[PDB]
Each structure stands twice: as C-alpha cells, then as structure tokens.
Amino acid sequence: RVSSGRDLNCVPEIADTLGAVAKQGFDFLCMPVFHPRFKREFIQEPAKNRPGPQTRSDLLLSGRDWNTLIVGKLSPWIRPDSKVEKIRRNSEAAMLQELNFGAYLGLPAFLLPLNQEDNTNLARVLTNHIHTGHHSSMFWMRVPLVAPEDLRDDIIENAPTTHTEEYSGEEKTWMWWHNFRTLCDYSKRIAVALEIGADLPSNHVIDRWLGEPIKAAILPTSIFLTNKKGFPVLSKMHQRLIFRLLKLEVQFIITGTNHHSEKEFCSYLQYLEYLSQNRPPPNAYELFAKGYEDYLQSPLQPL
Amino acid sequence: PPNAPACMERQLEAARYRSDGALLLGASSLSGRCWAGSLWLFKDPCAAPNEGFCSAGVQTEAGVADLTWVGERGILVASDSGAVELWELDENETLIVSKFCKYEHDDIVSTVSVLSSGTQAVSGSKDICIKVWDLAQQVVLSSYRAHAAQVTCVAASPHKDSVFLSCSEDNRILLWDTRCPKPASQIGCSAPGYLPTSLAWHPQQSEVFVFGDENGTVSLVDTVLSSAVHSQCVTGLVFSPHSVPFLASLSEDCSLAVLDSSLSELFRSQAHRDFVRDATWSPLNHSLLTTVGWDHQVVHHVVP
Amino acid sequence: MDNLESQTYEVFEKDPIKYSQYQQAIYKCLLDRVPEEEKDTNVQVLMVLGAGRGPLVNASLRAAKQADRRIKLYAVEKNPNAVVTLENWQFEEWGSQVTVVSSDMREWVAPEKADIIVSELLGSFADNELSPECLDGAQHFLKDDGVSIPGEYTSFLAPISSSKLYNEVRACREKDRDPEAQFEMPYVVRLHNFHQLSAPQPCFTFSHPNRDPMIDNNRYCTLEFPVEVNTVLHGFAGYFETVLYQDITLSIRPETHSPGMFSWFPILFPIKQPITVREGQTICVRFWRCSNSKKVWYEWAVTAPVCSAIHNPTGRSYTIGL
Amino acid sequence: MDNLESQTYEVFEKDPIKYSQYQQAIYKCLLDRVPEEEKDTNVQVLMVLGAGRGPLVNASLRAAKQADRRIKLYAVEKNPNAVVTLENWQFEEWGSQVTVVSSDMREWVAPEKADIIVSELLGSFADNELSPECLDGAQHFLKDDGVSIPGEYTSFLAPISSSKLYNEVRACREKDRDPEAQFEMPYVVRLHNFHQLSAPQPCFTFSHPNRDPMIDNNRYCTLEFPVEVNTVLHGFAGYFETVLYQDITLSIRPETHSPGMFSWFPILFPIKQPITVREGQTICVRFWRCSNSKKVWYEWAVTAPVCSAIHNPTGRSYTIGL
Ligand SMILES: CC(=O)N1CCC(Nc2cc(C(=O)NC[C@H](O)CN3CCc4ccccc4C3)ncn2)CC1
Ligand SMILES: CC(=O)N1CCC(Nc2cc(C(=O)NC[C@H](O)CN3CCc4ccccc4C3)ncn2)CC1
Ligand SMILES: CSC[C@H]1O[C@@H](n2cnc3c(N)ncnc32)[C@H](O)[C@@H]1O
Ligand SMILES: CSC[C@H]1O[C@@H](n2cnc3c(N)ncnc32)[C@H](O)[C@@H]1O
C-alpha cells in the first residue's frame, strides 16, 4: 500500500478534475490555489486595483476535501529573490497572500520550490508566515535531485556542459536545501519534496539525502521507460532509489502529461503499487521495531 | 453565431490580424470557478469584444497562454494543459473546430511561433522544453532541453525554417539553427543583466532582432542601443507592417509605447486599465494598432 | 489582528436561531423606516460591517423580501480570504445589489451614508472582539438618523468555584513567559464541572451609535456578589446579552439564554490564587476595560472578602489587537 | 513609545560639535533661501520637529542672527515633561518668536506650511529611532520647495569578531522569555575589545523630503565583506552618516568620524552562533527593515561562508514602537 498524489498546473474545474484523479487511484492532489498565470500587482496603479475575485471559491469543496485531498502550490511567477526590486516586493505580497489562503482553507501541505541557489528572501517570508498566526500546515520544498542546469542537453555550441566530474558541484541542490532550512532555524513544519530527474547522480548525492526530512518524492512521467508490452516502468537504479524511499516511508507524487498514450494514466500508479508489494520482505527486527522509528526515549535507569 | 459561447472570459491574452482584415482574439479565464479558454474571430474589429457581434466562436478546455495564425484558417494554441492544439476555420468561416490537440509538454505551454514554411512550428513551455512540431504530421519532430528555467518566449525567424529565437528565465537568449548538431547558440551581455521576456525579429534584416527584459528596457541586437521604455516587464514587442517599421511595446504597467528605429518613443497610450497583453497591426490601415488587455478592452490606436 | 479560517466561518454560520434573529431585526427596522407608500420609491442603504462569507448579506436579502422594501447592500470585510468568497457570491448570485468592499470599516471611505449598519462583531463577553472600536470608526458614514444593528450590548459576570478549571488554567503554563501569565487571560470555555456562586450581574455596556462628544470605551465597574454557602472562588464566568433591534435579542446568559444557540460559549476570567469564602460574605470584584492607541485589554481584581492582585496590569499577559 | 528623562536630554545637550554643525546647516540654508534684498521683508517658517528642551531652538536663533534673516519658529515636541521646559523657556526668554506645540508631528495640524524642518531623530544606526516614519508623517506641512535638515542619512555595517562581547550578549539571558532572544536585538555599545574584519559598507539610506508616490520605508540590503585573515565572526558593528545640509555632515563612522562627538556610540547586531571564517573568504550578510502599522524592526542573516538563521523574524525579540 502506497500513499500517492498527482501534480498539475491546470485545473479548469476543481470538482471534475479531483474526481477524475481520485478515480484513477490517487489519494490526493497538488494544485495551484491561484491561477499560475494570473499575475497580480500590489503597489502600482492601475493594475493594483484589479477587480476581484482573485481566485476560485472555498465553497467548491468540503472542509474534509481541503484537509485531506488538496496540496497547495505557489504560483511560478512568485519570485522573492528576483534582482528587480519591484518584483521582489510584489512576490513577497503574493507569497503571503497564497500561503495565508492555504492556511484559510486548511491545507495539509503547501509546495514551494528551491530551483535556484539564493532562496534567502523566500525563506524569510516563510519564516514570518510560520510565526504569524496559529497553524500547523506543512511546507514541502520542491528541490531537484540534479539541478536543471546540470541536467540540460549539451546542445549550446558556444557554452558546453562541464564534462569534468565535480564532487561538490554535484551536491549543489543539497546545499540549496541546507541553506534554506538553516535560515528557517530547522522548523519541524518544513520538509523536503525531492524531485527525481531523468539521469540519477553519483551514489554519494543520493546518500546525503536520507538523513533529511523527506515527506514526498516526485516522479515525472518523462523518466519512465517503456517496457515490452507498452506499460511505463523504471530502470534498476531508479527502482533501488524507490525501495529506499518506501523504507523511509514517503508520499509519492506523479507529475507531467501522459507520455504512454496506449495505456491510461493509472498505469504509473500501478507500477508503484507493484514495487511496494514486491519489496524485500520485512524481517523480525523490521516487523517488530516498526512504529518505534526515530522515537526518543529517556534511557532506562533500573537501579 | 452557432457554437459560440455566451460569455468570453475576462482576460484577453492574444490578438492577431489576418491578411484580409479579420481579428482573431484568444481569451482565458484566470479567476473564478472555471478556468478555461476561448477563441474568437471578428471580421469587424470595432465590434470586439461583443459575443453577439462576432463571426465565429468556440471554447477550449483550458486557458490560452498564446496563439498564432497558421495560414488563413489554422490557429495554433498554447494551452495550460500542456498541449499544443491546432484549431481550423470552417469553409464559411463561421465555426472553429479542433484539428489536433497533442499533450506533449509537462507544464503550461506559454509560447508558440510558426516558422517561415508554415508547415512547422515551435513551442516553448514552463517544463523547460522547446519542441519543433510538424503541423501536417501532428507529431513532434524534435524536443530540445537547452535552458535551465521556464521558457518565456520563442520567435521563429521570418525567412529561414531552420532558425528561431528563444529566451528563458535562465537569463539566456538562444539563436537556433536546426542544421547544426548543436543547434542553439547563446547570445547576450558580457555580464548577467535582467531576465529577458520578449523577442521580436526584424522583418527586413535577417540577423537583427529586439528583446525586452523584466525591468522594462528594450534592446536592439545584431548577430548596444537600448532604452528604458517601461517601468515594468516588457510582455511583447511587435513590428508594424510599414516600409520602415515601427516597434510596439507592451508591459505589465498597463501602457503601450511605439518606438522608431533609434528606439525613441513616438506614441504613448494608457487607455488600458490592466496588463496590456498583445498588440497587432492592421493590414489595411497601417497607422492603426489594436491592443488587448486583462481589462476586457479591445482598443484601437491612431499612430502617427 | 488575525483572520479567521474557512471552517471557523462554516461552523458558526450553521447556527439558525442567530441568523434568523438577525433577519427579523432587519425586517422590523425596514418596516419602521419606510411606510407602505414609499415601498418602491425609497431604497435603504445597508452596510454589513464585518460580512464574512455572506450569511448576514443573505439574511438581509431575505428580510428585505419579507418586508417588501428596496435596499442597497454593501458587504465590508477585512479578511481578504473571506472576500474571495464574497466576490464569487456577488458574481454568480447577488449581482449588482451587493457591493463588496475589501477594507477595514474604520479605514473605508464610503460613497454614500447608510440607513442601517449590520454587525456581528460580538464575543463571549460582548466587547472582547472590539465591536465598540470598530463601529465607532465606522459610524461617521451613518445617516444622522441611522440605525445600528445591534444597538446595544451588555456583558455579565458571576463568581464561580471550580477546582477542575482552576487546575486546567494552572496546567496552561508555558515556557518562555511569565509563570503566572496563564491566570491573567480570559478563556472561551464550555463550563461544566463548576459551581456558580451568585447570579450574573451586568458589567460593561456599550451603545451604537454613540453620540457622546468624547467617546471613551474605557470602563471601570465594581460588582458585589452575595454568596450564601461556604465555597472557594476560582474565577468569574462571563456571559453577554445584546439588543439587535427593539424586543429582538440574543443572549448566552443562563437565565435568558437564546435556545439552541451554540455560537457563543461563556468566557472565564480566572484568578491566580483561590480565595476562600464563608457563608454570608460578599465577593467584590472590580473590572477595568483599558485601551491605548494600539491594543485593548481587561484588568481585574478581587477586593472582598480579601484582596487579590490586579490581574493583567498593562496588558502584560493578554491584549486584543486593534 | 517612551519619553526621555531629564538627565538624558542634559547629557546629549552638552555636545558642542553637534549643535554647532546644526547651527551652520541652518545658516547656509537661510542664506541660500532669501537674498540680501529680502532680509527684512521675508520671514522663514522654521519647525523643529522633535525639539526636546530647546537646544535646536537656540541654535536656530543663533543661526538666524549669524545670517541676518527673519524666522518664525515652531517647537513641536511629544514628550510633555520636556514641553514643560520648552514652555518655561518660551515665557521668560524666547518670547513670541517661538510657538510651542505639544503634539506628535504626524498628528499635528499646522497653521501654516514650513520653509525648513529641523529634526534630531537619529540613532546609532540612523533610522533606528524611526526618523523616517515621523518625518514622512510631517512632510505634508512642508512647503512644496521646502528643505528638511537633515536631508539624508545612511547606515553602515562592518563584521566584527569579539569574544568578549559575544559572551556579554550571552549573559544577557533573561527569564520569562526566549533563551536566545538576547542575540536577536541590537545593542548601543562603545566597542572596545573587538576586531573589525572589513571596512564599513553602506546598508540603508533615507532621504527627506521623499517625493515618491508610494513611500515604502521597508528595505532589503545584501552586503559582501572580504576578510583577509582567519577569524571568528560574532556580530556586526553599526555606524551612520548624515547630510544635514550640503557639505555640512555628521558621522560616527570611524573613517569619517566627527571629532569629539560622543552623542552617538555604535550599535551591535549580534549573531546567535559564532561563524568561523577563513583567510580570503567573504562574509555575506543580509539585512531587512520591516514594518507594520504598529512597529518597525530589523531582521538579519548571514549566508556566507555558512548560513546563519534569520534573526528576529517578525520582531519576535525586538521591535521599535510607532
Ligand atoms: C457547529 C456546532 O454545533 N458547534 C460549534 C462548536 C461549539 N461552539 C464553540 C463556540 C466558541 C465560541 O464561543 N467562540 C467565541 C466566538 O467569538 C463566537 N463567534 C460566533 C460568531 C462567529 C461567526 C463566524 C465566525 C466566528 C464567530 C465567533 N468557540 C468554539 N466552539 C458548539 C458546537
Ligand atoms: C556627556 C558625555 O561626555 N558622555 C555621555 C555618555 C556617553 N555616550 C552615550 C551615547 C549613547 C548613545 O549613543 N545612545 C544612542 C542615542 O540615540 C543617541 N542620541 C543622541 C541625541 C540625543 C539627544 C537628546 C537626548 C538623547 C539623544 C540620544 N548612549 C549612552 N551614552 C559619552 C560620554
Ligand atoms: C463574522 S465574525 C466577524 C467578522 O468581521 C470582520 N471584521 C472584524 N473587524 C473588522 C473591521 N474592523 N473591518 C472590517 N471587517 C471586520 C472579521 O474579519 C470577520 O469577518
Ligand atoms: C531630542 S532627541 C528626539 C526628540 O524628538 C521627540 N520626538 C520623537 N518623535 C517625535 C514625534 N513623532 N513627534 C514629536 N516629537 C517627537 C522625542 O520625544 C525627543 O524629544
């Protein structure tokens, strides 16, 4: 059994789409609470007085659905560490607005991305929102296993890709997260949603992550290989990383469009269920200790 | 008109004139219970945006980030769904039907441009992919991942099928030649500046183009010369159909400007009340310029 | 200072007796404000000050149809997450009748003055969510003959002995703060294992609109509660009563409690230290409502049969933000 | 939010170089504002915003006599205990020339607009006593061509290593509060046993009068300090520089320090946790000036060579009251 979620940036009708993904086999949905292209100005007129409503209505779903089925998503134009002052200011206002709306709705988690190196002003705004108002909403930082730049295709003739192995340059994304987390003073409310790319990085990178608070793991459809029949599958090193994560017990999330148009979409999910059932079986220590994981007891003083 | 929807969505994203004089507008619903899109054809432009006084209307499944004319009946659409869809005009030019809707991108499709051939197109997305499409075959010939951030704009050269521009939130401007085994080649400043956002080819010099950045500055380059035109991001740039063309610039400061060739401003309009999204020049009256914004306005300007 | 979550609104919106009491107050006010011969010439300006998700707006529509009069509605709300609900309602249902305003009432410049201002800014102790301050900053856009609904509210207090609740306030001690701070703050609590020692008596009262030349929402009230048993005082229960319009009233006072109205639980002002009380003695409690330019708070002390210590001096433990 | 005692005023009034710098700024401004042929027809409106016990009033009188021009004086003060001094001075000495006002400048409705507004609202880190907010609320009664003295001010920062001062901030731990709160607040301190690691660089700058259409006193500044020794960072020193008028300046920056001016000591933004720094690395510090409708505060963090934690998020440890 595996807790599973679907990611989208396009949801025209919330009722319809939520039903369709739930019928696929998914436990929850990651959507934007605002339209990701609906850019909003807070300072300059005339755009700041744009007439409402700014987003869809909370009544389209029950308190229970917002609490157990939806996961917020910060709009992608919200960039608080922009080099442009006006942009940083609007993005701070927009972040607070989207995160406070998620708190209003009661969302169990809320997604935010670590896609560049400097996320300092982003961290601060989050820290402030954490400390302002009484809530327990969680925050899933979307950080990639290999950075976009370190994954691009070597097709730029006059700016090639560094083919020299860099030990600490391949650990770039971890430091994005270590910095963000250190700036927020290790909040229990801040967790990592680890994005998994097409080509996995050297084993050391993978090893320096499972000490961290992973609550979700993100798999795009583009990494799935096709097998003999026509179903989506995964290489053996990717499968090994999966086995690790299910041991560390996380919520998997599928993103991207259907690339295997011969079979429906629940096939990716079924592949996940497959591996879950077909995992190395639990021994007597693993069966018995289960439930005590990372639980701190004062030590026994039998004198 | 039959099949038309009763209401067109408040946020007008794109507006493009056809050679005869028809206005194609594409609108997206960015707020409210339903987040969809719509395509409309107005053989009379001064009638826009009345749903009752249109020549043809239809509604797509999702918002319309960008579109462009494919000939005189085809319409290329960049859907939030992650799909590039081609809708074609009826024989009588009263209806609009989806010819193909291909879901190849893993995130909002934000740019489409048609190559000089008219049988091939190129799309940019927020998934960091650029795809080259065969409109005939309805499949993707090539899928390039050259950028390190969301692809903001792609603009196909007006005369070479192999050559097109792209710019991304990774501070990169690329020039592409599908004939090279490393198609893309990086243009730009010696030092990191502000993110590029809009690309416009020049209609008469095949190696010259203009780009506008997120800070509101427009620049002219040859494979220097720049002016701070807007206070905010430059969302688009469009050249006039004149013998010596005028440059139209659009911004998120709800203003439009028209520049010459030394990028000296000549026209200035603030009639729009929300982001001024797209601008298209009249093929009949060359001193006439139509603009659409998120304030549901279709505004026509008399340019000197 | 804080904005309510969506489910909070949802639970307190599901209380029928409250909103129908409000409907009827509006109905009676509409009738007494325009006669049968003006029922089509005269449009009443209605301003919901603190509108939420629109239950008072709907009850205003229902009351205007009960009373066959014309109204012009304004829905003023400060919480923008709730405004998203209001503006979607105004699009697909209310239409142009309702004009939605996303502003603080004290800060909003209004197009026209109002005939009636409806408010639901009341707490378990009447004024503890600061209904006074807000409506005083909003009465400047009220017609010189205008009606506030509600028109007045009174808070009530009664001494109680509960060893259970005393222990629970005691357990509410938190690190990084005063170890006695927990007794210097009121609590909304559904009192159950407790002993009311004397019948509630009125404490602070406020009237709207307040046409005094100098408005002062500060207060000082001294109450004497005769007890006819031995007992040990642990706090004071707080209740309230409010006049919506004329004989239409809402109350959580146990004597005159509105039936089936779960919207307000009582409040509890504890005392640090239990005060033993004999048969026949009197309990004297003093209560102050203090404010500055930024916050508002309650101070309170027991003076008979023995003095307590002035609780929450200077709002040092508890303050209500403006 | 607090009013200064009498001896505080007295000590900082005994600094000659400051008040004579102010005298000369006034003198140069008076000359450049009325020519020799208007020296008897034209009376300049002068408003001392934050007047104290009257040292700026006297230096205004002295400057008007140096420059042989006519002035009309207003002494605006908020602290009423200091107003008692001002009003006794105005009775027995200044006479009708000075008009004493006991009000907050942001709140005072003025009879006429001013030619010049003099202010001494500056702290060890320039804006930390909130000169900006006050003068922005007082510039509405400034002539459209008016001059503020001072006209601009800039704050400065420099990383320091001091094991002594780190231990002293550590010892400043107080019960009933966050055990790390003491590192999340600045201190006015006369730095002595310390090691400045890199030359001061400018942080936040403010200009008066600020003719921007939307005034935003919030700030975000990122500074990079190259260090050429191994060392262990314990905080950042704060200094300031201000342009009174033209070339007349005051500064406590050690490079351009005004001589014999003891009025301002430097400020110190500590960091919770010492950060070890190698030869050749760079220290990156970020600083934010944040405000709401009620208070103003500084947040700060170190990002290079290793991240620190955002200090004083939300003003949770330190805030400056409006
Ligand atoms: C449904 C239902 O059967 N039950 C709801 C929960 C319970 N009752 C309460 C009451 C209070 C209490 O009194 N709180 C003080 C508030 O100021 C009250 N007002 C009411 C008006 C209002 C309107 C909208 C949003 C908030 C408020 C707050 N707290 C928590 N549980 C009874 C069972
Ligand atoms: C006489 C004298 O030889 N010494 C006075 C004491 C000592 N110096 C200081 C300085 C400060 C320090 O810098 N504080 C920050 C204040 O904002 C400064 N400003 C100055 C302007 C002013 C005017 C009137 C009243 C207050 C202020 C505060 N603290 C305490 N001791 C030097 C020796
Ligand atoms: C429905 S319970 C109280 C409601 O009134 C709103 N409200 C409270 N105070 C104000 C105010 N000063 N201005 C506007 N709305 C207010 C609250 O945010 C909430 O929606
Ligand atoms: C002389 S040091 C600062 C002086 O300015 C006064 N002051 C500070 N802020 C204000 C204000 N907003 N309005 C009036 N006086 C002020 C202080 O109370 C003190 O006298």
CB atoms within 10 A of CB B162: 17
Mapping DSSP onto H, E and C, the string for C135-170 reads HHHHHHHEEEEEEEECCEEEEEEEEEECHHHHHHHH
Helices C80-89 and A85-105, packing angle to 10 deg: 70
Mutation target to probe the A interface, by most A beta carbons within 10 A, among B107, B175, B185, B190 is B107
Q: Are D92 and D85 in contact (CB under 8 A)?
A: no
DSSP one-letter code for A229: S
Give the tokens for residue A221.
């459809």
Please report the beta strands in chain C, taking only residues with DSSP state E, as ranges in sequence order: 43-49, 70-77, 98-102, 114-119, 142-149, 152-161, 187-188, 195-196, 201-207, 219-226, 231-245, 248-251, 267-277, 282-291, 295-304, 320-321
- Cα C157 to middle of ligand 4, angstroms: 43
Give the tokens for residue C21.
């009491």
The ligand that comes nearest to the alpha carbon of residue C266 is: 1
Burial of C212 (0-12, 13-18, 19+ CB in 10 A): exposed
Q: Which residues contact D37 (CB under 8 A, 6 or more apart)?
A: none
Interchain proximity A86–B231, CB inside 8 Å: yes
Helices C55-66 and C16-33, packing angle to 10 deg: 50
Task: Kindly give the pairing relationship between strand D142-149 and strand D114-119.
Answer: parallel
CA distance to partner chain C, nearest, from residue B86 (Å): 32
CA distance to partner chain C, nearest, from residue D177 (Å): 4
The ligand that comes nearest to the alpha carbon of residue C321 is: 3
Distance CA D162, CA D194 (A): 5
Nearest to A133 among C2, C10, C91 (CB): C2
| Nearest-5° Cα angle at D30, D29 to D34 | 120
Distance CA C147, CA A184 (A): 50
CB atoms within 10 A of CB B98: 15
User: Which among D289, D262, D210, D199 is positioned nearest to D236, based on CA atoms?
Assistant: D199
Nearest to A104 among C5, C88, C102 (CB): C5
Distance CA A65, CA A303 (A): 52
Nearest CA residue ID for atom 4, ligand 1:
C262
Residue stretches of the annotated binding site of C for a protein: 12, 120, 129
Sign of CA dihedral D268, D271, D277, D280: negative
Residue in this structure with the two tokens 């620190």, named with its chain if needed: D308
The helix (run of H) or strand (run of E) holding residue D74 is strand D70-77
- D19 a known binding residue? yes
Nearest CA residue ID for atom 23, ligand 2:
D12
Task: Kindly give the pairing relationship between strand B217-222 and strand B208-213.
Answer: antiparallel
Q: Which residues contact B50 (CB under 8 A, 6 or more apart)?
A: none
Residue stretches of the annotated binding site of C for S-adenosyl-L-methionine: 9, 18-19, 77, 104-105
CB atoms within 10 A of CB C263: 18
Q: Is the CB of D3 under 6 A from ligand 2?
A: no
Q: Is the CB of D43 under 6 A from ligand 2?
A: no
Q: Is the CB of D309 under 6 A from ligand 2?
A: no
First-last CA distance in chain B = 36
Distance CA D115, CA B240 (A): 52
CA distance to partner chain C, nearest, from residue B32 (Å): 7
CB atoms within 10 A of CB B261: 12
Q: Are D286 and D304 in contact (CB under 8 A)?
A: no
Distance CA B129, CA C24 (A): 62
Task: Kindly give the pairing relationship between strand B288-293 and strand B64-70.
Answer: unpaired
Distance CA D233, CA D270 (A): 9
Give the tokens for residue B254.
């709800």
Distance CA B225, CA C118 (A): 61
Q: Which residues line ligand 1 (CB under 6 A)?
A: C 4, 8-9, 11-12, 14, 52, 123-124, 129, 188, 262-265
The residue type found at A62 is: S
The ligand that comes nearest to the alpha carbon of residue D120 is: 4
Question: How many helices (H) and strands (E) in chain D?
Answer: 6, 16
Give the tokens for residue D171.
């010892």
CATH topology for B5-304 is: Methylamine Dehydrogenase; Chain H (2.130.10)
Residues in A closer than 8 angstroms to C78, CB to CB, are none
User: Which among C264, C262, C206, C274 is positioned nearest to C236, based on CA atoms?
Assistant: C274
Task: Kindly give the pairing relationship between strand C152-161 and strand C201-207.
Answer: antiparallel
Q: Which residues contact D302 (CB under 8 A, 6 or more apart)?
A: D233, D271, D275, D283, D284, D285, D286, D308
Q: Are B101 and B85 in contact (CB under 8 A)?
A: yes
Mapping DSSP onto H, E and C, the string for A150-169 reads HHCCCCECCCCCCCCCCCCC
Q: Which residues contact D230 (CB under 8 A, 6 or more apart)?
A: D277, D278, D279
Q: Is the CB of D12 under 6 A from ligand 2?
A: yes
Distance CA C273, CA C305 (A): 13
- Cα D86 to middle of ligand 2, angstroms: 21
Give the tokens for residue C321.
């933000």
- Cα B161 to middle of ligand 3, angstroms: 61
Query: CB of B147 within 8 Å of any CB in chain A?
Result: yes
- Taking CA–CA distances from A54, the nearest residue in chain C reads C84
Q: CA-CA-CA-CA torsion for B275, B277, B283, B285, nearest 10 degrees?
A: 0
Q: Is the CB of D52 under 6 A from ligand 4?
A: yes
Helix (H, G, I), strand (E, B) or coil at A32: coil
- Ligand 4 probe mutation, D134, D136, D320, D322, most atoms within 8 A of CB: D134
Burial of D226 (0-12, 13-18, 19+ CB in 10 A): exposed
CATH topology for D152-322 is: Hnrnp arginine n-methyltransferase1 (2.70.160)
Q: Which residues contact B113 (CB under 8 A, 6 or more apart)?
A: B68, B121, B122, B154, B155, B156, B164
Sign of CA dihedral D171, D176, D179, D182: negative
CA distance to partner chain A, nearest, from residue B163 (Å): 14
Q: Are C267 and C188 in contact (CB under 8 A)?
A: yes
Q: Are A82 and A120 in contact (CB under 8 A)?
A: no
Q: Are A231 and A271 in contact (CB under 8 A)?
A: yes
User: Which among D290, D294, C84 is positioned nearest to A100, based on CA atoms?
Assistant: C84
Give the tokens for residue C40.
């089509």
The residue type found at C246 is: Q
Distance CA C76, CA A173 (A): 46
- Cα D101 to middle of ligand 4, angstroms: 12
- Outline which parts of chain D fall under CATH 2.70.160.11: 152-322
Give the tokens for residue B70.
């494919």
Residues in A closer than 8 angstroms to C85, CB to CB, are 57-59
Residues in A closer than 8 angstroms to D310, CB to CB, are 123-124, 127, 183-185
Task: Kindly give the pairing relationship between strand C152-161 and strand B96-103.
Answer: unpaired
Residues in D closer than 8 angstroms to C316, CB to CB, are none
Solved using: X-ray
Q: Cα separations (Å) of A244 from A279, B27, B273, C24, D47?
A: 10, 46, 54, 64, 72
Give the tokens for residue C176.
């990084």
Please report the beta strands in B55-183, taking only residues with DSSP state E, as ranges in sequence order: 56-60, 64-70, 74-79, 83-89, 96-103, 109-114, 120-125, 130-134, 139-144, 151-156, 163-168, 172-177
Q: Is the CB of C12 under 6 A from ligand 3?
A: no
Pick the CATH number of D1-151 from 3.40.50.800, 1.10.10.10, 3.20.20.70, 3.40.50.150: 3.40.50.150
Report long-range pairs for A199-207 (Cβ below 8 Å, ≥24 apart): A199/A146, A199/A151, A200/A145, A200/A146, A200/A237, A200/A238, A200/A241, A201/A145, A201/A146, A201/A170, A202/A165, A202/A170, A204/A167, A204/A170, A204/A171, A205/A145, A205/A146, A205/A170, A205/A171, A205/A174, A206/A145, A206/A241, A206/A244
Distance CA D182, CA D318 (A): 9
Interchain proximity C179–D176, CB inside 8 Å: yes
Interchain proximity D301–A120, CB inside 8 Å: yes
- Outline which parts of chain D fall under CATH 3.40.50.150: 1-151
Q: Are C43 and C72 in contact (CB under 8 A)?
A: yes
Distance CA B5, CA B56 (A): 10
- Ligand 2 probe mutation, D22, D189, D264, most atoms within 8 A of CB: D264
Distance CA B304, CA B286 (A): 10
Mapping DSSP onto H, E and C, the string for D156-187 reads EEEEEECHHHHHHHHHCCCCCCCCCHHHHCCE
- Cα D120 to middle of ligand 4, angstroms: 8
Q: Which residues contact B52 (CB under 8 A, 6 or more apart)?
A: none
Helix (H, G, I), strand (E, B) or coil at D275: strand
Q: Are C50 and C76 in contact (CB under 8 A)?
A: yes
- Ligand 3 probe mutation, C118, C121, C131, most atoms within 8 A of CB: C121
Supply φ then ψ for residue D54, to 5 degrees. 110, 35
Distance CA D141, CA D105 (A): 10
Burial of B262 (0-12, 13-18, 19+ CB in 10 A): exposed
Q: Are B294 and B277 in contact (CB under 8 A)?
A: yes
DSSP one-letter code for C126: B
Q: CA-CA-CA-CA torsion for C226, C231, C233, C237, nearest 10 degrees?
A: -60
Query: CB of C294 within 8 Å of any CB in chain D?
Result: yes
The answer to whether chain D touches chain B by having 3 or more C-beta pairs less than 8 angstroms apart is no
Q: Is D129 a catalytic residue?
A: yes
The answer to whether chain C touches chain A by having 3 or more C-beta pairs less than 8 angstroms apart is yes
Helix (H, G, I), strand (E, B) or coil at C303: strand
Q: Is the CB of D184 under 6 A from ligand 4?
A: no
Residues in D closer than 8 angstroms to C294, CB to CB, are 294
Active site residues of C: 120, 129
Residue A235 C-alpha from the chain's centroid: 22
Interchain proximity A131–D316, CB inside 8 Å: yes
For the CA of D52, the closest atom of ligand 2 is 24
- Cα C25 to middle of ligand 1, angstroms: 21
Residue in this structure with the two tokens 């440890």, named with its chain if needed: D317
Burial of B20 (0-12, 13-18, 19+ CB in 10 A): exposed
The residue type found at D5 is: E
Give the tokens for residue B111.
């740019």
Distance CA B183, CA B232 (A): 32
Distance CA C192, CA C230 (A): 20
The answer to whether chain A touches chain D by having 3 or more C-beta pairs less than 8 angstroms apart is yes
Residues paired with residue D242 on neighbouring β-strands, in sequence order: D153, D250
CA distance to partner chain C, nearest, from residue A54 (Å): 7
